[PDB]
Design a protein around this ligand. Structure first.
Ligand SMILES: Nc1ncnc2c1ncn2[C@@H]1O[C@H](COP(=O)(O)OP(=O)(O)O)[C@@H](O)[C@H]1O
Ligand SMILES: Nc1ncnc2c1ncn2[C@@H]1O[C@H](COP(=O)(O)OP(=O)(O)O)[C@@H](O)[C@H]1O
Ligand SMILES: [Mg+2]
Ligand SMILES: [Mg+2]
Ligand SMILES: [Zn+2]
Ligand SMILES: [Zn+2]
Lengths: 621, 49, 651
DNA sequence: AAAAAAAAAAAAAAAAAAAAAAATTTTTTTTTTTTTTTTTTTTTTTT
C-alpha cells in the first residue's frame, strides 16, 4: 500500500518543479505555465505526460499505470490545491458556472467562522468547483494493446488502443453533480453522480431544516448543477490485428469534457484511457456474481495514420516547378505507367475552389471514372487513394449498398432515441469516395451517386427516414467496359472518364514485367531519379494546397472560351462535350493553380487541364 | 386415468425438474434435506420458519 | 469465524492420489513435462488426459467423472501444490490453478440433445456449434476499497457461487464504512475475472432430420472466455449443473441447467500439427535428398484415387502451398493465393478433386453454386435485436480466411455472387458496411472452383470463350483455368477403367473382413470418440492394392500434410535470374505471335498473369524448400501457365 | 442458674416491572420469449 498524502506531495513537486526547453529551446515550466493559465481560466484540459513524469519518477508512472483512476484524482486534487497560489489576477467571469462558483466561495467565506469544524458532508464537493479537468498521455514505453486483448486482467489500468471509429453519439449534457434547492431553509444540496443512474433526493438535509424539523422538500434543478460534455463512441479493431477468421472487435469509449468532438465515425484513432467497469444491476442475472460492463474512459484521443490533425526543405520543394510531377509520380509509385491517370488522381485529391455566385453552388469537387480492361490496377489505384486521402471511403460492388452508402436510422442507448447514422457517402462527406464496380453497382445506389455528384446531397423520402443529407465528396469510380460499354449516363456526369486499354506490346510489357518483378523482389518500386514522397508528406502538401483558393483572372476568359468552342467544334465534327466539360476545364485549371500554390490560375494550368482532358477523351478511341 | 388418441404438434426441450429439493437456513446454515416434490406441474411453498 | 474442516478423509485421499498422478516423474514424466511447459508458457490451466488418469487410477477417474466439483477442487489443490513445489514464486503469483479434462469419455461424451438431467454434477464432453456468444464481462472476485475519512484500506472477497447456494451477505458491495464514511474503490488494486456465456447447439448434420435443434448454455471464465465465436464446431468439456434461482418463497421446481466449461477445443484439423524430432528429421531428409523432383512426386501423390490430370494436380499443389503476400511499406498489398477454376466435360472427377482439397487442406469451406447466396457467401450485417446495434456475421470466404473455398457449380452460381466475390478473389478481403457499422473483413482464401461448360458438355469445335460463359473480368482473376476434357481415347479409357476398378476393389486391411458395411446409425458416433477433435508416422505409403508396383513410392497422407504445413511457412525470395526469365516469358506470352494458329486463349493475359507466374514459381520454391525462387521454379511456372492458358480448337 | 419473654435469623411465598419470546404469505411487477405485421429490399420472370 501507499500513502496518498505522500503521493499528492510527489505530484505537487513534479507539477511545480518540472521544466522543459520546449519553447524555442528556452527553459520553461511546462506545467507551471499551464497551471497559471487554468487558474486564470484560460485553459480547461491539463494533459499530464507520463513520459515527462517518468523522466524523474518512474515508480510514480508505474503506480499511475496500475491504478490510474486513483492517481487521476490525486493529480486533479493537487492541481486544485495549487491553483490559488498560481492565480495572478481576477478572472472575468466568462461563464455562468464561474458566476456560481464565485458566489459559492464568497458566501462560504462570509459564513466561514474559520476556527469552527464543519461536518464532512457540510461542504462543497470537489467536482462542483473545478472548471478544469486532468487527463493523461500514456507513456511511450507502453506498447498499445489490442481491443480484443484488453480484458478483465487490465481493469483500472491505463492502456492505449488504436482502431477505426464506427459509431459516435452526439455531445449531450451528462450530470456530474446534481444541485437541489430547498423550499424551507434556503440552502443547497449536492449529489455527486457516479452511477449511470441516480434517484433524485426528496428531503433537504441542511442544518436549518434539520433543526426546524420541517418538511424540507428540495427541488432538483439544472441551473446550479454541474454538467460535462459527454459522448459515447464505438471503436473497432484494425483489419491487420484481427485474428485469422474472426471479425473485428468493438470497444465502448466514454468521452468527457474537452476530449469531445475530436473523433468522428470513420476516423483512425488512438485512444488512451482507463479500462473501467460499469455495474450491471437491474437485469435478472442468470449467473450469480457482480457482473459489470467494460469501457475505456477517454483521456487522450489522437487521430492517426490517415487523418492526423513548415521547413525550409519543404518550402524549397514547393518552390520547385516540377513539384506537380513529383507528387504525381509519388501517387502509387509501385504502379508502372499511367502517368496522366495519376496526375488526374492528384488533381482529384486537391480539388477546385467552391463557388457561390448569387444563390447557387458550383462545387469544386473533381469526379473521375476509371474504365478499363481487367488487371490495369484500377482497384489498386482506388485503394491507394483511399489510404492516402484524409476522409476516404472505399466501397466495393454491393457489400456496402443501400444504407451502406446512404444514412439509416438506429435506436440509441444513451437516449434510446432514433439517431440518423451516415453511410459511406456521409462518412466521406468532405473527402473521397472510391466506388469500385460502379457499373455493376445497384440501380438505387447508382442513382444516389448521380444525385451526390449533381448536388452533393442525398435526399431520402422512405418510411423511417425523411431527410436531406450532405455528402460533399469527390467520386472516384472504377468501372469496366461506346467501345463495348460506355454509357452516356457516365459521360454526362463524370468530369474525367478515363479508358485504360492494355494492348499487348513487347517493349512496354517487358518494362512492366521488370517493374513488377523488382517490386516482388524488394517490396518496393524500382529506384528512380526522384524518391517518392511519404504519405504523410503527400497529405501535408495536398492539405496546404487545399487552402490556397486561386481565382480566375478575366484575362483568361477569352482563352478558355476559345478552347471550349474549339472542343465543341471537334466533338460536333467527330463521331460528347457540354457546359459540364467547360466546368471540368475550369475546376481542373483551378486545381492545377492550387497545386502550384498561386492565387491566380495561368495559361500553363489551363493547357495542362486541356491536355489531361484530351488524353481522357482520346483514350476512348 | 384416461386414455386419449392424438397427433403431437410440439415437443419442448427436455428441461430439469426437481423430485427432491434441499434447503438451507441463511443464518444458522442448517439443512432440510430431501423434501419431496409433488409430481407433475405442481409447485411448492418454502417454509417460513 | 466459522466451521473449518480438520480431517476430511475423502479430500485428503483425493489430494494424495492427484499429487501422485501429477508426480509422473517415474511414469516418463508426461504430466511433469506438461506442468513445466505451462509454467514456462505462463499458463494456469492444466489439461489432463482422462484416459491417462483412468490408466493410473481408475478409481480416481470414476470419482472425478461422477463427482465433478469436489474432485476438480481436490485436483486443483494438488496442481497448485505441485506448481509450488516445482516453482514457488509462480504458484504465489497465480491464486488458483484450474484443471480441464480431455480424452475418451465412455458415456459422458454426449451432445446437447442426449445431455439429460442424468449428467448433473458430472463431467460431460459436449460437441456442437456455437449459436451465439456474449460480451466478455469482468466479475469482481476481490474488491479493494479506500476510506478517505480514515485512510483505511479494506479488501472484500467474493466466492464463485455460480452453482451454489448464495445469500445476500456474500454479494453485497461495500459502499460505506462502519461509521458511514463513503468509500472509494481501487479498480487497479481490485481483482476481476473475465466471464462469458455461449450457446452450443447440436450440429445440424448430426441432429435428427426434420426436428428442431437442442441447445445448451455454457459458462466460460478466465482463460477460456474467447475460445470460440458463433459458428464454431466446438467440443466443450465441463461440469453440468443446475443454476440457482432467485430467493423466492414459492418454487415451481424448475431448474435451469448450464455447463461450466473446464476446457474448450476447436476442430483439430486446423490445430497446430505436432512435429516431433523424428518427424522434423524425416522432413529434412526428404527435402534434402529429393529436391529436383520433389514437386512432381508430391503432385502425383496428391490424389491417388483420381487418375491422370497431372497438370491440374500440380496446379492444386501450387494452390495448397500458396505464394507469399507482398506487404509494401506504403500499405499496398499483393495476394499470394492462387485461384484455380476447373471446367470441362461431366464425369472428369473435378468435384472429386474439390472434395479431396476439402478433406485435406486446413480451413477448407465447401460451397455450391446456389448453396450460398451473397450475404451467406461473403460477410453479412445484421442487428442484435436486443441492443439495437449492428453486428457482423462471417461468410464462407471469411471463415475460409487463410484457407480454401471449394466452390462447385460455379457456372450455376448467380452472376451477383461472382461479382461480390470478385474482391475476395484478388484483394482477399470483404468490404461491407451499413449505416451503423463498416468493416473490411480479411478473407485471404484461395478459390478452387468447378463448373460445367455451356451446353453441358464441352464443344471441341467452338472457341473456349464461347464454351465458357464467364466474361473476361471474372476469368482474369482466376490464376489458372483448366479445361478437363473427357477424351474418348481407347487407351486412356483403359487406364481410367483399370484405376477405377482397382480403387473399387480395394478393402481396408484388418477393419474390413470382406463383407462388412461400415455405416453406423447415430449412436456409435457418440459411443466412440469423435474423430474430429481427437489428439508414429511414416513417409512413403507401403505397397498395396492402390497401385501394382514400380520404382516410385507414394507419399503418405499424414507425411504430405506435415510437409505441406512446414513448406507453406517458407517465404522463398525471388532471384534476379528467375525475375528476368519470368519477365521475358511474360512479354512473349502476352505477344500473341508466340502461340501457334488454330489456338484460342482460355483466359486473357494480364499483369495478373505475370503475378500468377510469380506465385507459381514461389510455390514451386516452397515445395522444394528452396527459400529462393530458382530457374527450375520459373520454368515450372511458365510451363503450367502456358499449358493452362491455351487450348487447340479442333476442326 | 433456669425459665419466660423479646428480638433476630433463616427461610419460604407472592407481586410488579422490565426484558424476552413467538407468530408472520400474498400480491404485483416485469422480463423474456414468442408471434405478428409493415415496409424495404432483393430475386425471379417476362417482354
Ligand atoms: N500498371 C500496373 N502496374 C503494376 N501492377 C499492376 C498494374 N496493373 C495491374 N497490376 C497488378 O495486377 C493485379 C490486378 O490489378 P487490379 O487492381 O485488380 O486491376 P483492376 O482494377 O482492373 O481489377 C494487382 O495485383 C496489381 O498489382
Ligand atoms: N480420371 C478419373 N479417374 C477416376 N475416376 C474418375 C475420373 N474421372 C471421373 N471419375 C469418376 O466420376 C465420378 C463422378 O465425377 P465428378 O467428381 O462428379 O465429376 P463432375 O463434377 O465433372 O461430375 C467419381 O466417382 C470419379 O471416381
Ligand atoms: Mg477492379
Ligand atoms: Mg460436379
Ligand atoms: Zn432545507
Ligand atoms: Zn436457522
Amino acid at each position: 500500500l501507499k500513502d496518498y498524502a505522500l503521493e499528492k506531495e510527489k505530484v505537487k513537486k513534479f507539477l511545480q518543479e518540472f521544466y522543459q526547453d520546449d519553447e524555442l529551446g528556452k527553459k520553461q515550466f511546462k506545467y507551471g505555465n499551464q497551471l497559471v493559465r487554468l487558474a486564470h481560466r484560460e485553459q480547461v484540459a491539463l494533459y499530464v505526460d507520463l513520459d515527462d513524469v517518468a523522466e524523474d519518477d518512474p515508480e510514480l508512472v508505474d503506480s499511475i499505470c496500475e491504478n490510474a483512476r486513483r492517481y487521476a484524482k490525486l493529480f486533479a486534487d493537487a492541481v486544485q490545491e495549487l491553483l490559488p497560489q498560481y492565480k495572478e489576477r481576477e478572472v472575468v467571469n466568462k461563464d455562468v458556472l464561474d458566476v456560481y462558483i464565485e458566489h459559492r466561495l464568497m458566501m462560504e467565506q462570509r459564513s466561514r467562522d474559520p476556527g469552527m469544524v464543519r461536518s464532512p458532508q457540510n461542504q462543497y464537493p470537489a467536482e462542483l468547483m473545478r472548471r478544469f479537468e486532468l487527463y493523461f498521455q500514456g507513456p511511450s514505453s507502453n506498447k498499445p494493446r489490442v481491443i480484443r486483448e484488453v480484458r478483465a486482467d487490465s481493469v483500472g489500468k491505463l492502456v492505449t488502443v488504436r482502431g477505426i471509429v464506427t459509431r459516435v453519439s452526439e455531445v449531450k449534457p451528462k450530470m456530474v453533480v446534481a444541485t437541489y434547492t430547498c423550499d424551507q431553509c434556503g440552502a443547497e444540496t449536492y449529489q455527486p453522480i457516479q452511477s449511470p443512474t441516480f434517484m433524485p433526493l426528496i428531503m433537504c438535509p441542511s442544518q436549518e431544516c434539520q433543526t426546524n424539523r420541517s418538511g424540507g422538500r428540495l427541488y432538483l434543478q439544472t441551473r446550479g448543477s454541474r454538467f460535462i460534455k459527454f459522448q459515447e463512441m464505438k471503436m473497432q479493431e484494425h483489419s491487420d490485428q484481427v485474428p485469422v477468421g474472426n471479425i473485428p472487435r468493438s470497444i465502448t469509449v466514454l468521452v468527457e469534457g474537452e476530449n469531445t468532438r475530436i473523433a468522428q465515425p470513420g476516423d483512425h484513432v488512438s485512444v488512451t484511457g482507463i479500462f473501467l467497469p460499469i455495474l450491471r444491476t437491474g437485469f435478472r442475472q442468470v449467473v450469480q456474481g457482480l457482473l459489470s460492463e467494460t469501457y475505456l474512459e477517454a483521456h487522450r484521443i489522437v487521430k492517426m495514420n490517415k487523418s492526423e490533425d513548415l521547413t525550409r526543405e519543404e518550402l524549397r520543394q514547393i518552390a520547385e516547378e516540377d513539384f506537380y510531377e513529383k507528387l504525381a509520380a509519388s501517387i502509387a509509385p509501385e504502379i508502372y505507367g499511367h502517368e496522366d491517370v495519376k496526375k488526374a488522381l492528384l488533381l482529384l485529391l486537391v480539388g477546385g475552389v467552391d463557388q457561390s455566385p448569387r444563390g447557387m453552388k458550383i462545387r469544386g469537387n473533381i469526379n473521375i471514372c476509371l474504365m478499363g480492361d481487367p488487371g490495369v490496377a484500377k482497384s489498386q489505384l482506388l485503394s491507394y487513394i483511399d489510404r492516402l486521402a484524409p476522409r476516404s471511403q472505399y466501397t466495393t460492388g454491393r457489400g456496402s449498398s443501400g444504407v451502406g452508402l446512404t444514412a439509416a436510422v438506429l435506436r440509441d442507448s444513451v437516449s434510446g432515441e432514433l439517431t440518423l447514422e451516415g453511410g459511406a457517402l456521409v462518412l466521406a462527406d468532405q473527402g473521397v469516395c472510391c466506388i469500385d464496380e460502379f457499373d455493376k453497382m445497384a440501380e438505387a445506389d447508382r442513382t444516389a451517386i448521380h444525385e451526390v455528384m449533381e448536388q452533393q446531397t442525398i435526399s431520402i423520402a422512405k418510411a423511417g427516414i425523411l431527410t436531406t443529407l450532405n455528402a460533399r465528396c469527390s467520386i472516384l469510380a472504377a468501372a469496366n467496359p461506346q467501345n463495348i460499354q460506355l454509357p452516356a449516363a457516365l459521360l454526362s456526369r463524370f468530369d474525367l472518364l478515363w479508358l485504360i486499354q492494355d494492348r499487348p506490346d513487347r517493349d512496354n510489357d517487358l518494362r512492366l514485367a521488370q517493374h513488377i518483378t523488382y517490386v516482388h523482389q524488394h517490396s518496393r518500386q524500382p529506384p528512380s531519379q526522384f524518391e517518392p514522397l511519404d504519405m504523410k508528406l503527400m497529405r501535408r502538401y495536398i492539405a496546404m494546397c487545399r487552402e490556397k483558393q486561386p481565382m480566375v483572372p478575366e484575362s483568361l476568359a477569352d482563352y478558355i472560351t476559345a478552347a471550349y468552342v474549339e472542343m465543341r467544334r471537334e466533338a460536333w465534327a467527330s463521331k460528347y462535350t457540354s457546359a459540364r466539360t467547360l466546368l471540368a476545364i475550369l475546376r481542373l485549371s483551378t486545381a492545377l493553380a492550387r497545386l502550384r500554390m498561386v492565387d491566380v490560375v495561368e495559361k500553363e494550368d489551363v493547357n495542362e487541364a486541356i491536355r489531361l482532358m484530351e488524353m481522357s477523351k482520346d483514350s476512348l478511341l | 386415468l384416461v386414455k386419449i388418441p392424438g397427433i403431437i404438434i410440439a415437443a419442448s426441450a427436455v428441461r430439469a425438474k426437481a423430485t427432491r429439493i434441499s434447503i438451507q437456513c441463511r443464518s444458522c446454515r442448517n439443512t432440510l434435506t430431501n423434501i419431496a416434490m409433488r409430481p407433475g406441474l405442481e409447485g411448492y411453498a418454502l417454509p417460513r420458519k | 469465524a466459522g466451521t473449518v474442516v480438520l480431517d476430511d478423509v475423502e479430500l485428503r485421499e483425493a489430494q494424495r492420489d492427484y499429487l501422485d498422478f501429477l508426480d509422473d516423474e517415474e511414469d516418463q514424466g508426461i504430466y511433469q513435462s506438461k506442468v513445466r511447459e505451462l509454467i514456462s508458457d505462463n499458463q494456469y490451466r492444466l489439461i489432463v488426459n482422462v484416459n491417462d488418469l483412468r490408466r493410473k487410477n481408475e478409481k480416481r477417474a470414476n470419482r472425478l467423472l461422477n463427482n465433478a466439483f469436489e474432485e476438480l477442487v481436490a485436483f486443483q489443490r494438488a496442481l497448485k501444490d505441485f506448481v509450488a513445489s516445482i516453482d514457488a514464486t509462480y504458484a504465489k503469483q497465480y491464486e488458483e490453478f484450474y484443471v480441464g479434462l480431455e480424452g475418451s469419455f465412455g458415456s459422458k461424451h454426449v451432445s446437447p440433445r442426449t445431455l439429460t438431467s442424468c449428467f448433473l454434477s458430472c463431467v460431460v464432453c459436449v460437441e456442437g456449434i456455437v449459436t451465439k456468444c456474449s460480451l466478455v464481462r469482468p466479475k469482481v472476485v476481490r474488491s479493494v476499497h479506500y476510506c478517505p475519512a480514515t485512510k483505511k484500506t479494506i479488501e472484500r472477497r467474493y466466492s464463485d457461487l455460480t452453482t451454489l447456494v448464495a445469500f445476500p451477505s456474500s454479494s453485497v458491495y461495500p459502499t460505506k464504512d462502519e461509521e458511514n464514511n463513503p468509500l472509494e474503490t481501487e479498480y487497479g488494486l481490485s481483482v476481476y475475472k473475465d466471464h462469458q456465456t455461449i450457446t452450443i447447439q447440436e450440429m445440424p448434420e448430426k441432429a435428427p432430420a426434420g426436428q428442431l435443434p437442442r441447445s445448451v448454455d455454457v459458462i466460460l471464465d478466465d482463460d477460456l472466455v474467447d475460445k470460440a465465436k458463433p459458428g464454431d464446431r466446438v467440443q466443450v468439456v465441463g461440469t453440468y449443473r443446475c443454476l440457482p434461482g432467485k430467493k423466492g418463497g414459492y418454487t415451481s421446481g424448475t431448474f435451469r441447467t448450464v455447463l461450466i466449461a473446464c476446457n474448450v477445443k476447436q476442430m483439430s484439423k486446423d490445430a497446430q500439427p505436432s512435429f516431433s524430432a523424428e518427424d522434423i528429421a524425416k522432413i529434412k531428409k526428404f527435402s534434402k535428398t529429393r529436391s529436383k523432383d520433389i514437386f512432381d512426386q508430391l503432385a502425383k501423390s496428391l490424389a491417388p484415387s483420381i487418375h491422370g490430370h497431372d497438370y491440374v494436380k500440380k496446379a492444386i499443389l501450387c494452390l495448397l502451398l500458396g505464394g507469399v503476400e507482398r506487404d509494401l511499406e506504403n500499405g499496398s498489398h499483393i495476394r499470394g493465393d492462387i485461384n484455380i477454376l476447373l471446367i470441362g466435360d461431366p464425369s472428369v472427377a473435378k468435384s472429386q478433386l474439390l472434395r479431396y482439397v476439402l478433406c485435406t487442406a486446413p480451413r477448407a469451406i465447401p460451397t455450391t453454386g446456389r448453396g450460398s447466396s451473397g450475404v451467406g457467401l461473403t460477410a453479412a450485417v445484421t442487428t442484435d435485436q436486443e441492443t439495437g446495434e449492428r453486428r457482423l456475421e462471417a461468410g464462407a470466404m471469411v471463415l475460409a480466411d487463410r484457407g480454401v473455398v471449394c466452390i462447385d457449380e460455379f457456372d450455376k452460381m448467380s452472376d451477383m455472387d461472382r461479382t461480390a466475390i470478385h474482391e475476395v478473389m484478388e484483394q482477399g478481403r470483404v468490404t461491407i458496411a451499413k449505416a451503423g457499422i463498416h468493416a473490411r473483413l480479411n478473407a485471404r482464401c484461395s478459390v478452387l472452383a468447378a463448373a460445367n461448360p455451356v451446353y453441358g458438355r464441352y464443344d471441341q469445335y467452338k472457341t473456349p470463350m464461347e464454351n465458357i460463359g464467364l466474361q473476361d473480368s471474372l476469368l482474369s482473376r482466376f490464376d489458372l483455368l483448366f479445361i478437363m476434357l473427357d477424351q474418348m481415347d481407347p487407351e486412356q479409357d483403359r487406364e481410367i477403367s483399370d484405376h477405377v476398378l482397382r480403387m473399387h476393389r480395394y478393402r481396408a486391411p484388418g477393419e474390413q473382413d470382406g463383407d462388412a458395411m461400415p455405416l453406423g446409425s447415430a449412436v456409435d458416433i457418440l459411443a466412440t470418440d469423435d474423430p474430429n477433435f481427437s489428439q508414429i508416422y511414416e513417409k512413403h505409403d507401403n505397397l498395396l492394392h492402390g497401385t501394382k508396383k514400380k520404382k516410385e513410392k507414394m507419399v503418405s497422407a499424414a507425411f504430405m500434410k506435415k510437409y505441406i504445413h512446414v513448406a507453406k511457412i517458407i517465404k522463398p525470395v525471388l532471384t534476379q535470374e528467375s525475375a528476368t526469365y519470368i519477365a521475358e516469358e511474360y512479354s512473349r506470352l502476352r505477344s500473341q505471335d508466340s502461340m501457334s494458329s488454330d489456338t484460342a486463349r482460355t483466359s486473357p493475359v494480364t499483369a495478373r498473369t505475370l503475378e500468377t507466374l510469380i506465385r507459381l514459381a514461389t510455390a514451386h520454391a516452397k515445395a522444394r524448400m528452396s527459400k529462393t525462387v530458382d530457374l527450375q521454379d520459373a520454368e515450372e511456372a511458365v510451363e503450367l501457365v502456358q499449358y493452362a492458358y491455351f487450348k487447340k480448337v479442333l476442326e
